[PDB]
Design an enzyme around this catalytic site. Structure first.
Site, PDB file in Angstrom:
ATOM      1  N   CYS A 182       0.809  -1.220   0.000  1.00 15.53           N
ATOM      2  CA  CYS A 182       0.000   0.000   0.000  1.00 15.53           C
ATOM      3  C   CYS A 182       0.845   1.274   0.000  1.00 15.53           C
ATOM      4  O   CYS A 182       1.568   1.536   0.954  1.00 15.53           O
ATOM      5  CB  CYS A 182      -0.978   0.018   1.192  1.00 15.53           C
ATOM      6  SG  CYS A 182      -1.913   1.568   1.335  1.00 15.53           S
ATOM      7  N   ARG A 228       0.107   4.655   2.870  1.00 18.53           N
ATOM      8  CA  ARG A 228       0.206   4.468   4.326  1.00 18.53           C
ATOM      9  C   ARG A 228       0.607   5.708   5.170  1.00 18.53           C
ATOM     10  O   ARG A 228       0.634   5.633   6.397  1.00 18.53           O
ATOM     11  CB  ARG A 228       1.123   3.288   4.642  1.00 18.53           C
ATOM     12  CG  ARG A 228       0.555   1.933   4.263  1.00 18.53           C
ATOM     13  CD  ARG A 228       1.555   0.844   4.622  1.00 18.53           C
ATOM     14  NE  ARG A 228       2.557   0.623   3.588  1.00 18.53           N
ATOM     15  CZ  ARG A 228       3.662  -0.097   3.764  1.00 18.53           C
ATOM     16  NH1 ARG A 228       3.917  -0.653   4.943  1.00 18.53           N
ATOM     17  NH2 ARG A 228       4.521  -0.261   2.763  1.00 18.53           N
ATOM     18  N   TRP A 283      -9.008   6.503  -0.788  1.00 14.42           N
ATOM     19  CA  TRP A 283      -9.266   7.228  -2.015  1.00 14.42           C
ATOM     20  C   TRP A 283      -8.269   6.768  -3.083  1.00 14.42           C
ATOM     21  O   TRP A 283      -7.228   6.191  -2.777  1.00 14.42           O
ATOM     22  CB  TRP A 283      -9.236   8.750  -1.784  1.00 14.42           C
ATOM     23  CG  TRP A 283      -7.981   9.270  -1.155  1.00 14.42           C
ATOM     24  CD1 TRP A 283      -6.772   9.442  -1.765  1.00 14.42           C
ATOM     25  CD2 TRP A 283      -7.814   9.725   0.196  1.00 14.42           C
ATOM     26  NE1 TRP A 283      -5.857   9.960  -0.878  1.00 14.42           N
ATOM     27  CE2 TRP A 283      -6.472  10.148   0.332  1.00 14.42           C
ATOM     28  CE3 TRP A 283      -8.667   9.813   1.304  1.00 14.42           C
ATOM     29  CZ2 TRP A 283      -5.958  10.648   1.537  1.00 14.42           C
ATOM     30  CZ3 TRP A 283      -8.163  10.311   2.498  1.00 14.42           C
ATOM     31  CH2 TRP A 283      -6.817  10.721   2.606  1.00 14.42           C
ATOM     32  N   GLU A 306      -4.423   4.070 -10.781  1.00 11.60           N
ATOM     33  CA  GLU A 306      -5.206   2.843 -10.632  1.00 11.60           C
ATOM     34  C   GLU A 306      -6.332   2.806 -11.666  1.00 11.60           C
ATOM     35  O   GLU A 306      -6.604   1.764 -12.268  1.00 11.60           O
ATOM     36  CB  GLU A 306      -5.803   2.733  -9.235  1.00 11.60           C
ATOM     37  CG  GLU A 306      -4.789   2.634  -8.113  1.00 11.60           C
ATOM     38  CD  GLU A 306      -5.464   2.669  -6.738  1.00 11.60           C
ATOM     39  OE1 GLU A 306      -5.977   1.608  -6.306  1.00 11.60           O
ATOM     40  OE2 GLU A 306      -5.495   3.762  -6.107  1.00 11.60           O
TER      41      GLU A 306
HETATM   42  C1  HEM Z   1      -6.206   6.805   1.706  1.00  7.58           C
HETATM   43  C2  HEM Z   1      -5.831   6.644   0.432  1.00  7.58           C
HETATM   44  C3  HEM Z   1      -5.215   5.311  -0.067  1.00  7.58           C
HETATM   45  C4  HEM Z   1      -4.503   5.215  -1.184  1.00  7.58           C
HETATM   46  C5  HEM Z   1      -4.155   6.389  -2.123  1.00  7.58           C
HETATM   47  C6  HEM Z   1      -4.076   3.845  -1.345  1.00  7.58           C
HETATM   48  C7  HEM Z   1      -3.312   3.365  -2.378  1.00  7.58           C
HETATM   49  C8  HEM Z   1      -3.132   2.036  -2.694  1.00  7.58           C
HETATM   50  C9  HEM Z   1      -2.659   1.507  -3.951  1.00  7.58           C
HETATM   51  C10 HEM Z   1      -2.305   2.327  -5.212  1.00  7.58           C
HETATM   52  C11 HEM Z   1      -2.586   0.186  -3.842  1.00  7.58           C
HETATM   53  C12 HEM Z   1      -2.172  -0.782  -4.966  1.00  7.58           C
HETATM   54  C13 HEM Z   1      -3.509  -1.306  -5.483  1.00  7.58           C
HETATM   55  C14 HEM Z   1      -3.420  -2.076  -6.777  1.00  7.58           C
HETATM   56  O1  HEM Z   1      -2.669  -1.647  -7.699  1.00  7.58           O
HETATM   57  O2  HEM Z   1      -4.142  -3.111  -6.881  1.00  7.58           O
HETATM   58  C15 HEM Z   1      -3.016  -0.179  -2.504  1.00  7.58           C
HETATM   59  C16 HEM Z   1      -3.069  -1.446  -1.970  1.00  7.58           C
HETATM   60  C17 HEM Z   1      -3.471  -1.765  -0.686  1.00  7.58           C
HETATM   61  N1  HEM Z   1      -4.019  -0.890   0.250  1.00  7.58           N
HETATM   62 FE1  HEM Z   1      -4.031   1.163   0.111  1.00  7.58          FE
HETATM   63  N2  HEM Z   1      -4.579   3.111  -0.285  1.00  7.58           N
HETATM   64  C18 HEM Z   1      -5.292   3.978   0.529  1.00  7.58           C
HETATM   65  C19 HEM Z   1      -5.970   3.612   1.680  1.00  7.58           C
HETATM   66  C20 HEM Z   1      -5.966   2.366   2.265  1.00  7.58           C
HETATM   67  C21 HEM Z   1      -6.700   1.958   3.450  1.00  7.58           C
HETATM   68  C22 HEM Z   1      -7.650   2.893   4.233  1.00  7.58           C
HETATM   69  C23 HEM Z   1      -6.406   0.668   3.685  1.00  7.58           C
HETATM   70  C24 HEM Z   1      -6.893  -0.266   4.812  1.00  7.58           C
HETATM   71  C25 HEM Z   1      -7.442   0.183   5.945  1.00  7.58           C
HETATM   72  C26 HEM Z   1      -5.479   0.240   2.661  1.00  7.58           C
HETATM   73  C27 HEM Z   1      -4.917  -1.013   2.549  1.00  7.58           C
HETATM   74  C28 HEM Z   1      -4.346  -1.561   1.424  1.00  7.58           C
HETATM   75  C29 HEM Z   1      -3.992  -2.958   1.288  1.00  7.58           C
HETATM   76  C30 HEM Z   1      -4.157  -4.091   2.324  1.00  7.58           C
HETATM   77  C31 HEM Z   1      -3.405  -3.093  -0.107  1.00  7.58           C
HETATM   78  C32 HEM Z   1      -2.890  -4.393  -0.759  1.00  7.58           C
HETATM   79  C33 HEM Z   1      -4.038  -4.984  -1.580  1.00  7.58           C
HETATM   80  C34 HEM Z   1      -3.595  -6.253  -2.271  1.00  7.58           C
HETATM   81  O3  HEM Z   1      -2.625  -6.911  -1.785  1.00  7.58           O
HETATM   82  O4  HEM Z   1      -4.222  -6.607  -3.307  1.00  7.58           O
HETATM   83  N3  HEM Z   1      -5.248   1.288   1.810  1.00  7.58           N
HETATM   84  N4  HEM Z   1      -3.323   0.982  -1.836  1.00  7.58           N
HETATM   85  C1  LIG Z   2      -4.399  -9.523  -5.817  1.00  5.35           C
HETATM   86  N1  LIG Z   2      -5.823  -9.754  -5.959  1.00  5.35           N
HETATM   87  C2  LIG Z   2      -6.772  -8.742  -5.523  1.00  5.35           C
HETATM   88  C3  LIG Z   2      -6.449  -7.369  -6.103  1.00  5.35           C
HETATM   89  N2  LIG Z   2      -7.139  -6.365  -5.296  1.00  5.35           N
HETATM   90  C4  LIG Z   2      -7.591  -6.668  -3.939  1.00  5.35           C
HETATM   91  C5  LIG Z   2      -7.363  -5.102  -5.877  1.00  5.35           C
HETATM   92  C6  LIG Z   2      -7.508  -5.024  -7.261  1.00  5.35           C
HETATM   93  N3  LIG Z   2      -7.731  -3.850  -7.872  1.00  5.35           N
HETATM   94  C7  LIG Z   2      -7.819  -2.713  -7.162  1.00  5.35           C
HETATM   95  C8  LIG Z   2      -7.681  -2.726  -5.772  1.00  5.35           C
HETATM   96  C9  LIG Z   2      -7.797  -1.412  -5.030  1.00  5.35           C
HETATM   97  C10 LIG Z   2      -6.817  -1.292  -3.874  1.00  5.35           C
HETATM   98  C11 LIG Z   2      -7.029   0.042  -3.186  1.00  5.35           C
HETATM   99  C12 LIG Z   2      -7.473   0.054  -1.873  1.00  5.35           C
HETATM  100  C13 LIG Z   2      -7.678   1.255  -1.222  1.00  5.35           C
HETATM  101  C14 LIG Z   2      -8.179   1.259   0.198  1.00  5.35           C
HETATM  102  C15 LIG Z   2      -7.440   2.446  -1.895  1.00  5.35           C
HETATM  103  C16 LIG Z   2      -6.998   2.407  -3.214  1.00  5.35           C
HETATM  104  N4  LIG Z   2      -6.759   3.571  -3.870  1.00  5.35           N
HETATM  105  N5  LIG Z   2      -6.810   1.217  -3.832  1.00  5.35           N
HETATM  106  C17 LIG Z   2      -7.450  -3.935  -5.115  1.00  5.35           C
END
Ligand code: HEM
Ligand SMILES: CNCCN(C)c1cncc(CCc2cc(C)cc(N)n2)c1
Ligand code: HEM
Ligand SMILES: CNCCN(C)c1cncc(CCc2cc(C)cc(N)n2)c1
Ligand SMILES: C[C@H](O)[C@H](O)[C@H]1CNc2nc(N)[nH]c(=O)c2N1
Ligand SMILES: C[C@H](O)[C@H](O)[C@H]1CNc2nc(N)[nH]c(=O)c2N1
Ligand SMILES: [Zn+2]
Lengths: 404, 405
Positions: free
Chosen positions: A108, A111, A280, A285
């Protein structure tokens, strides 16, 4: 031995010591590195030890460590596991645990925000219907008229004696993918299977490219139920471009709220199989992956043709040119609609600040380089040049099998 | 099912298993506890024989004679040589096999579709720094081939017990000087500051341009390195212009045609070739994105974005992305105009996927460093982004070695 971590743009070096707190092995071995793999190939004493460690974490975080409230709390947990095989978290502990899970998520990039997380306790939930109520309030809270706020709703934990609470959708908002007889797909190809499962359970299908799916919600050992989200709850952003009038004609759009609803949240050995979380978007993405991936909406050639680009050769960089205008469209459109969005440069710069904060706070920060570095303009962002160490800390978000 | 790493392509949904990684003898930097894959540089007697035996087995397999009488006689020949001298010598065709297999084995190289097409110059007879210079000029001439670039490697004498190394001090055969300024800034290439100061300490009269070609510092066994200036006509360069932005040419940017890495160690069957410069042709993002736009290199992004009249006061205008694209286009356009071989990041990654498929059939896998294979711009627009990869070390190999000073 602790990893030496170097930034190649600045020449600066840190040492990751936080990784020694890892209790969970990842996919790599000294023989071969498997870091680019997306998914894993995959006892009262053990539950009790993860519980102790987590409770210690909590009391350490509120600097009441070693005190009487601390001692008595470990005794409660131990007493409860000893006779029931499990235990339950206090709301305050769950709030701490959820924030740490986000903090610890190596994939993520957002963070920097980890301490600002609204947590809804939905553990008093006994039916799909109540889940739906909880989910609706989460969406309303999180969206906040385009002023997005990060949130998580936590449904009842897994229990040895029964089936899981589950949300079958991978996100609270997903566009339908309609498989055609002629091989192709109308809408989002990523969502063909869930679209079909929705129809099977009696959903009346649409025929658009952007039909918002119903939620399939499941209470333990029951067939899932179908719930349509009220269209006024799903904020959407029509996509236009600041200087290319024709872009708007393409009829492209995306939803405002990225809300992941299929991951497992683990805290102190307890597992929460339904715990949807949202923040958000980062613009790449939507603009790069969702719209330009060849196995998604795949709109690159379309846009390039409208831009009158030489589509016939790779060396004209039409793909690169079109992708940039698409990402710009997303940013412009979200900003015009007053819906929160972050570009990949701003996001990665704040992630660097986060690394620095975490180095000071904890001695390191678990980070998955391949997921942190944006899908376009990688080396144009500071994270590209930053070495990173990947490892698993608990509390954690984990993947889990689809419930069908 | 299978007890080998399962590898998935997420674009196509297809699965393979890598069995080749089983052949890996040397451990990389990762453990079950943490992944150190994004680190650029992570921390003989009986030993020699085993590496030697393994390489010869590889060789005889490549020519389909495993277990044969020539195979066992070569093994005997080698251990006899090690028994009485501590080292041994490669036959010519063994060296040619080893050098190609080292390239084939290189996890960070996206150009490996060409691996079988490598010209190997044997220079194991070389005995002076002047002679190293002759071999290098010859290599450059052959490899440049007036813009029609040809892959090549020149192999100088191996490390010998007691005796000192053959080393080329420069990281590449062609390198622009980096002059450290009074104000703290750098004129030229900041990457080459140290080697520039080394050339000067050894008596090179320095220039003051952004694009001064460095002399070579060549070191023969147990001798101080000698300085050698390349004849400018041997160093083919390409002035950079843009196909529509007419002002771009006025920026005075250029790059050299021939990427020739000169500071890596080639290891074959335990034998170490400390000087063995190899060259191919460029992928455009190496020049256009890394060398020209890295903040710690030429750093021209803001210059170009101002000329393009972009809003450089906010990240969300994507000025960086817009400028980087046009700089990459200029590189491709100018090399194409100058009839000098180059490949864009789309064509290159497409060809690497074909290479992965060739190797899956030939060897049951391909060692690959995802972070290095995916290009620095437009990552997910290229098909390798959606391809899981397994990274591991096989030998023959190109390895990093400490700078000789
Ligand atoms: C607040 C703005 C946030 C932004 C801009 C953001 C951004 C991102 C991005 C760009 C990814 C990669 C997603 C992808 O390409 O599939 C990601 C993954 C992830 N985010 Fe964040 N996130 C945010 C908030 C959060 C919150 C609130 C949580 C949990 C409480 C979170 C937990 C995670 C987790 C667990 C992943 C890994 C997902 C996976 O393994 O497929 N994020 N995030
Ligand atoms: C790896 N297999 C599942 C992929 N996955 C869970 C996933 C796929 N495509 C998009 C997202 C969005 C992840 C995300 C989460 C949050 C909280 C914010 C954000 N901007 N993106 C997640
Ligand atoms: C023919 C065209 C070739 C192309 C397009 C190509 C492409 C590349 C690229 C883009 C890199 C990344 C380097 C970086 O970002 O620093 C690389 C690295 C590398 N290449 Fe190739 N290459 C070619 C030929 C060769 C040849 C002929 C050899 C050796 C015989 C070779 C061996 C290597 C090695 C060992 C690396 C790793 C360098 C390192 O880790 O620092 N390449 N190559
Ligand atoms: C990472 N440490 C070594 C630096 N290094 C070897 C390096 C740095 N920057 C650029 C290159 C060019 C690599 C290369 C080699 C060959 C034969 C062809 C090509 N297109 N690129 C190499
Ligand atoms: C195979 C490869 O690891 C896969 O395509 C990864 C690469 N990096 C990624 N990074 C993000 N943020 N999201 C992704 O889905 C992926 N996909
Ligand atoms: C930290 C990171 O490993 C480092 O910046 C890498 C990323 N990927 C790369 N990929 C290539 N081809 N060349 C490089 O120099 C780098 N640098
Ligand atoms: Zn690894």
């Amino acid at each position: 031995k602790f990893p030496r971590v170097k930034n190649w743009e600045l020449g600066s070096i840190t040492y990751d010591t936080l990784c020694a707190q890892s209790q969970q092995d990842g996919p790599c071995t000294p023989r071969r590195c498997l870091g680019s793999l997306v998914l894993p190939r995959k006892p009262a004493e053990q539950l009790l030890s993860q519980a102790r460690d987590f409770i210690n974490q909590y009391y350490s975080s509120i600097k009441r460590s070693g005190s009487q409230a601390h001692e008595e709390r470990l005794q409660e947990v131990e007493a409860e596991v000893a006779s029931t095989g499990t235990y339950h978290l206090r709301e305050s502990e769950l709030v701490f645990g959820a924030k740490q899970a986000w903090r610890n998520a190596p994939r993520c990039v957002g963070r920097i925000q980890w301490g600002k997380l609204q947590v809804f306790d939905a553990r008093d939930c006994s039916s799909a219907q109540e889940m739906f109520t909880y989910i609706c309030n989460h969406i309303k809270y999180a969206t906040n008229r385009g002023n997005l706020r990060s949130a998580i709703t936590v449904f009842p934990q897994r229990a040895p004696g029964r089936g899981d609470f589950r949300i079958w959708n991978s996100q609270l908002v997903r566009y339908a993918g309609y498989r055609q007889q002629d091989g192709s797909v109308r809408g989002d190809p990523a969502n063909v299977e869930i679209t079909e499962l929705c129809i099977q359970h009696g959903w009346t299908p649409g025929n658009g490219r952007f039909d918002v799916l119903p939620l399939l919600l499941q209470a333990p050992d029951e067939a899932p139920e179908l719930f349509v989200l009220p269209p006024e709850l799903v904020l959407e952003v029509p996509l236009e471009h600041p200087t290319l009038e024709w872009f708007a004609a393409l009829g492209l759009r995306w939803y405002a709220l990225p809300a992941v609803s299929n991951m497992l949240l683990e805290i102190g050995g307890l597992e929460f199989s339904a715990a949807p979380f949202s923040g958000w978007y980062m613009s790449t993405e939507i603009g790069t992956r969702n719209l330009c991936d060849p196995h998604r909406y795949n709109i690159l050639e379309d846009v390039a043709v409208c831009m009158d680009l030489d589509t016939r050769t790779t060396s004209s960089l039409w793909k690169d040119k079109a992708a940039v205008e698409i990402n710009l469209a997303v940013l412009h459109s979200f900003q015009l609609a007053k819906v929160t969005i972050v570009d990949h440069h701003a996001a990665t710069v704040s992630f660097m600040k986060h690394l620095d904060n975490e180095q000071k706070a904890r001695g390191g920060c678990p980070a998955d380089w391949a997921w942190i570095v944006p899908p376009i303009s990688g080396s144009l962002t500071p994270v590209f040049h930053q070495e990173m160490v990947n490892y698993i800390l608990s509390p954690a978000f984990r993947y889990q099998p689809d419930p069908w």
